[PDB]
């Protein structure tokens, strides 16, 4: 939204925590076991 | 941005490897299985 975030040398830490929580959601999706064993 | 694309590729590969089991699980959940 702000033009300060449009530069690549400045980071938004809250966006980092949001996308890191997204990676943790992908991790919790990766925890499952889908082999049949039958 | 390519590392997140690799992550999405790994997720898509894991989901398309077991597409039949997830499909039959959703079919039992949605009551749509021809006996």
């Amino acid at each position: 939204l702000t033009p300060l975030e449009k530069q690549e040398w400045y980071i938004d830490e809250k966006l980092v925590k949001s996308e890191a929580a997204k990676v943790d959601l992908m991790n919790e999706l990766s925890r499952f076991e889908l082999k049949d064993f039958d | 941005k390519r590392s997140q694309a690799k992550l999405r590729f790994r997720i898509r590969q894991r989901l398309l490897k077991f597409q039949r089991q997830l499909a039959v699980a959703n079919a039992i959940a949605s009551r749509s299985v021809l006996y």
Binding site: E8, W9, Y10, I11, V16, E19, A20, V23, M26, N27, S30, R31 | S3, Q4, K6, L7, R10
Partner: peptide, 23 residues
Amino acid sequence: IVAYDMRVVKFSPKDHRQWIYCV
């Protein structure tokens, strides 16, 4: 500081973390 970035590193098939890449 040239650039900040968020990279996704993979330690295992069950373990994906996020690090801060910096140039």
